[PDB]
Design a protein around this nucleic acid. Structure first.
Lengths: 71, 122, 65, 82, 129, 104, 216, 218
RNA sequence: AUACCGUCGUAGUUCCGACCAUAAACGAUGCCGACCGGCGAUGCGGCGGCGUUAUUCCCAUGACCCGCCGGGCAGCUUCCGGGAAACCAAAGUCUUUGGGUUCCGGGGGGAGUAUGGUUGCAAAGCUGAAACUUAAAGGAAUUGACGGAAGGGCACCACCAGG
RNA sequence: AAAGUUGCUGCAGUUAAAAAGCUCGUAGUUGGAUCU
């Protein structure tokens, strides 16, 4: 199981950070490519100029056309 | 076909279980005994539960019945129930013992028995 | 038995959209003397009287009365 | 069970097993409260007094109930020595 | 291999108590096991016991009563401040009325309540309730 | 109880001159009267303040008894294939989570 | 017996045990039975300590007599090898006997033709009568059983270690149990031997019934 | 009108048995719902925990029948839980009520801090496991209420515990497992041994033993 | 029909000396230690033995039979307790959570992919992402709509004998 | 915070994601009883 001695701190802390890099939400916060591939660049809002209008097709059981815009 | 329904069988078994004293192997007395016992509406029903009763006491003389249990059972099973032979096979004139059982007798401080006969396990 | 036990009653209620039929069938009891149901027992229901538990004989006794 | 005022504020105090001291449960339906008769010393007569033994469900399930009863009766002198 | 002879002994006592036994044999023995069972006994959980002195590490034969619920060891022996003693008895004990935590001080091997009385803290050894 | 063949205790009855003694002939009659529990409520408008009354006997809008009874009465108007029963004769207090599961 | 001289073993009863074959157990041996057995033979059959059997009879008699109403005890035997003995045990004591097949749910199912609530259970063979022991485990019945050397001691509260495979052994064990519960009840003097002679209780074995009918 | 079947029912019907604690003290099975209907009476309230419609597959196809989890409880007293699977939901609820009367069990109540007043909390932290659901009850200070999910909140109020910390583990979405698990814990309340209960038990005669002379007559 | 089937046939399969280091390399169960049920077989060693055979053995000695001990290989069974269950005397002693320690998993795909380092003659191996993508993917057990699965059994509104 | 879904308190690793193919081995971690 776990290393559970009294002089076992750096092994436990190294294990924590190493395995915490396998956490999806933590890695998404801290690898830093999820904030460099992010289109908004970590912004709540962005501002754009409309390039074209687009009709995106609906997904299978829902039948509609959704009105989107390429900005 | 001709198979007894549940009600005929059940009423006949109840008539067997209680008032067993007054019944008998003839049908017609069994035909007339139920009217003082059971308030049975139809006569065609009286005649069907009274036929199963005679058929069942024909089955009684073959021995015990797996459906009824009454502590009267006429007066014949009681007599063989308390049958006593004159001399018990238990009261044996000589009883066979094994030497380690003879040790059991020795250490159960009854070592002075005489009715035992001891043989080696040949 | 059905003839003197149930009381079939069919009525029509007239609502705004149409008609609904209502069928009430009340199985009366075997109330003998009673005027609630018919005295006649159900043709199958049989009642067996428990034995009046008589005195088991102990000694032959002749009592003059 | 017993507050500092002094009332024994509890619904009931359940009996305890005489073999392994466990609490006899409320829905411990394999529980046994068994009475074993006390005899007259000189005559061999049933006095009217008895000794009581409680067996829990678990010991009786393991089959160790008879051994528990025998050791209880032996320690209580219902069984002679040996 | 065998570390901690108090972990082995308390696990043996707990299992042989769970199976309803009247006596337990624990080997090896040790001064910390003797004092642990002593402070167990002073509180009326464990009752009598015996020390079979083989000339090697001897054995202890413990007479049990069914008054015990759980005897456990805390390994590693953490260092218990007196300011830390309530957050250990809120985590290991089942109540505020019964149960004890065995802790070792320079004043000896004792319980958490006697440690509170004597105002000293120590390392932890185990718990019993 | 319901067995076709029956056992009669006619022997053990001691005396019964007055079979129709006026004890069991209590005329139970509540259907056409206003003692019928199965009657419309003649609904009251909901107060704007959200509760009814003052003092300490305030029966509010969200009362568990009233809301449960209304949930059962709302359950009474389900589809015919749905089996309800007689939850009005006995007092039901059917909660919103239970009723929402059933309604769904 | 609480080491009472009145209650101790008698030489006639020793002879009865040795003639019956009650000491001669089975071949296999369950471990929880090891307390009642002394040793197996070069043959392979274990030998039962008869004084333990006697003491268990005394303890079972103390248990049965301790019930005020004699009809509370339900005394059961499903195997034919003891069906006849169990009947006269009722006639000896007043208990309610179960002979033949035991209807499952007799002790549990309250809406039942044969439903009854005992305060005790006496059983010939725990191997064969597995059902009433469990039904006792559902409804709080102390149980006395006549256990062999290879007998599961599940749900038995008094185990009487004896032979129960033979007919004579079963009959004699039931006989001394009935005799002892009557002696503790006080309807028979302990000094004078019981008039009911134990060859009454043995199995009849219908071919033996026939050859005894010609031998009349 | 009730007159019973069982010996315990006959003792309960007459004035021989004074409280339901006499039945619990000898762990006798309660085979008549009218015993609980008699002793507690109208003090039992009931809350339908859930009605889930299961569609059984038959030779006739697919048929809807409802399973009712119904918890009854005498506040500051007793608690029980019952499940029924029946065609119509009012009958399912009443059948679940009947089974929940026979499932009734006493709860032990203790104190968190100083033993002052009437007991309010579970005497010690207990745990109850039913099919991947673990419910742990922790003693809690006076006035804190029941910190728990709605299901064990209902069960613990109807059991009569005024205050309790509660911690659950598992797939607690299944309300059956969760309800039966907290029921397991509140049965383990008296299934536990505390140093309050260390005194040697005097054995009182069983009601069958005490009143066997009255039971002979009927 | 290019799978399918039968006929030949190279490297290979074999040995010797170096690389390669991967497998469903599986008990799908890290290693070391403690406690915790029963049974009756097996292997090895040891101990205690009525008796049986080396043509009766002249002493020891091998081979059967009854046990006991230790360490194994496995089976049967249990309401020891676990567990989602299948099942497990460990997968038990786990909310009553702490004997020591090592490795390793974090919804499913992309993906054991690209890139980089390193080993390798090579094929490859070890380490090993992300962008983007979906609300499931999965595990145990329970029934059966349906068999294109097989049996019976029924009926002058079916048949045989006929009218 | 809920997340005991980052687990020191306090997760998991037969079948759901997972025990290195196996053994040796250094640093590390851990380590029988014994003295007032």
């Amino acid at each position: 199981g776990k290393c559970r001695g009294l002089r076992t701190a750096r092994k436990l802390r190294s294990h924590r950070r190493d395995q915490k890099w396998h956490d999806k939400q933590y890695k998404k916060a801290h690898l830093g490519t999820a904030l460099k591939a992010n289109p908004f660049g970590g912004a709540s809002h962005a501002k754009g100029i409309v390039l074209e209008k687009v009709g995106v097709e609906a997904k299978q059981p829902n039948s509609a056309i959704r009105k989107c815009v390429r900005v | 076909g001709r198979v007894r329904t549940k009600t005929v069988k059940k009423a006949a078994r109840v008539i067997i279980e209680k008032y067993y004293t007054r019944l008998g192997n003839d049908f017609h007395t069994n035909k007339r005994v139920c009217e003082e016992i059971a308030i049975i509406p139809s006569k065609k029903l009286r005649n069907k539960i009274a036929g199963y009763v005679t058929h069942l006491m024909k089955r009684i003389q073959r021995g015990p019945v797996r459906g009824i249990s009454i502590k009267l059972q006429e007066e014949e099973r009681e007599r063989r129930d308390n049958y006593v032979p004159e001399v018990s096979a238990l009261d044996q004139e000589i009883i066979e013992v094994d030497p380690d059982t003879k040790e059991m007798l020795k250490l159960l401080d009854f070592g002075s028995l005489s009715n035992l006969q001891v043989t080696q396990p040949t | 038995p059905v003839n003197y036990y149930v009381d079939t009653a069919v009525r029509h209620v007239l609502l705004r959209q149409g008609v609904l039929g209502i069928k009430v069938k009340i199985m009366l009891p075997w109330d003998p003397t009673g005027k609630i149901g018919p005295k006649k027992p159900l043709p199958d229901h049989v009642s067996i009287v428990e034995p009046k538990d008589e005195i088991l004989p102990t000694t032959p006794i002749s009592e003059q009365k | 069970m017993q507050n500092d005022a002094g009332e024994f504020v509890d619904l009931y105090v359940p009996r305890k097993c005489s073999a392994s001291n466990r609490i006899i449960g409320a829905k411990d339906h394999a529980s046994i409260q068994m009475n074993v008769a006390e005899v007259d010393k000189v005559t061999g007569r049933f006095n009217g007094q008895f000794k009581t033994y409680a067996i829990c469900g678990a010991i009786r399930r393991m089959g160790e109930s008879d051994d528990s009863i025998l050791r209880l009766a032996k320690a209580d002198g219902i069984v002679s020595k040996n | 291999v065998r570390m901690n002879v108090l972990a082995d002994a308390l696990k043996s006592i707990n299992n042989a108590e769970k199976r309803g036994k009247r006596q337990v044999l624990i080997r090896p023995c040790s001064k910390v096991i003797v004092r642990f069972l002593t402070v167990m006994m002073k509180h009326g959980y464990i009752g009598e016991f015996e020390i079979i002195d083989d000339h090697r590490a001897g054995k202890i034969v413990v007479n049990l009563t069914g008054r015990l619920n759980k005897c456990g060891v805390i390994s590693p022996r953490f260092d218990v401040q007196l300011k830390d003693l309530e957050k250990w008895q809120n985590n290991l004990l089942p109540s505020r009325q019964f149960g004890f935590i065995v802790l070792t001080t320079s004043a000896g091997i004792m319980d958490h309540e006697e440690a509170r009385r004597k105002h000293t803290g120590g390392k932890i050894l185990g718990f019993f309730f | 109880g319901d067995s076709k063949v029956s056992i009669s205790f006619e022997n053990y009855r001691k005396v019964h001159p007055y079979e129709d003694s006026d004890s069991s002939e209590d005329e139970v009659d509540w259907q056409d009267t206003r003692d019928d529990p199965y009657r419309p409520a003649k609904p009251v408008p909901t107060p704007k303040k959200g509760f009814i009354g003052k003092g300490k006997d305030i029966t509010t809008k969200h009362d568990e008894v009233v809301c449960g009874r209304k949930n059962t009465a709302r359950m009474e108007n389900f589809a015919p294939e749905f089996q309800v029963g007689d939850g009005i004769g006995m007092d039901l207090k059917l909660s919103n989570h239970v009723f929402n599961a059933l309604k769904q | 017996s609480g080491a009472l001289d009145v209650l101790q073993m008698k030489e006639e009863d020793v002879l009865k045990f040795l003639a019956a074959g009650t000491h001669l157990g089975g071949t296999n041996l369950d471990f929880q039975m090891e307390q009642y057995i002394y040793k197996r033979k070069s043959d392979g059959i274990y030998i039962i300590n008869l004084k333990r059997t006697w003491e268990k009879l005394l303890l079972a008699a103390r248990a049965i007599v301790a019930i005020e109403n004699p009809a509370d005890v339900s005394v059961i035997s499903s195997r034919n090898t003891g069906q006849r003995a169990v009947l006269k045990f009722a006639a000896a004591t007043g208990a309610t006997p179960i002979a033949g097949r035991f209807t499952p749910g007799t002790f549990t199912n309250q809406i039942q033709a044969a439903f009854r609530e005992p305060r005790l259970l006496v059983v010939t063979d725990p191997r064969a009568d597995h059902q009433p022991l469990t039904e006792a485990s559902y409804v709080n019945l102390p149980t006395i059983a006549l256990c062999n050397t290879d007998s599961p001691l599940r749900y038995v509260d008094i185990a009487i270690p004896c032979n129960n495979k033979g007919a004579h052994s079963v009959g004699l064990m039931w006989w001394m149990l009935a005799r002892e519960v009557l002696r503790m009840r006080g309807t028979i003097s302990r000094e004078h031997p019981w008039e009911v002679m134990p060859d009454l209780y043995f199995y009849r074995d219908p071919e033996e019934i026939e050859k005894e009918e010609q031998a009349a | 009108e009730w007159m019973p079947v069982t010996k315990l029912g006959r003792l309960v019907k007459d004035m021989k048995i004074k409280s339901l604690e006499e039945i619990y003290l000898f762990s006798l099975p309660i085979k008549e719902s009218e015993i609980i209907d008699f002793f507690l009476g109208a003090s039992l309230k009931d809350e339908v925990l859930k009605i889930m419609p299961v569609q059984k597959q038959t030779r006739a196809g697919q048929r809807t029948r409802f399973k009712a989890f119904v918890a009854i409880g005498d506040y500051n007293g007793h608690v029980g839980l019952g499940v029924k699977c029946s065609k119509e939901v009012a009958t399912a609820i009443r059948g679940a009520i009947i089974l929940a009367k026979l499932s009734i069990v006493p709860v032990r109540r203790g104190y968190w801090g100083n033993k002052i007043g009437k007991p309010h909390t579970v005497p010690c932290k207990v745990t109850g496991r039913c099919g991947s659901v673990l419910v742990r009850l922790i003693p809690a200070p006076r006035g804190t209420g029941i910190v728990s999910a709605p299901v064990p909140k209902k069960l613990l109020m109807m059991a009569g515990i005024d205050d309790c910390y509660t911690s659950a583990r598992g797939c607690t979405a299944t309300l059956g497992n969760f309800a039966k698990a907290t029921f397991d814990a509140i049965s383990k309340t008296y299934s536990y041994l505390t140093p309050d209960l260390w005194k040697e038990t005097v054995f009182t005669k069983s009601p069958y033993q005490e009143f066997t002379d009255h039971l002979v007559k009927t």
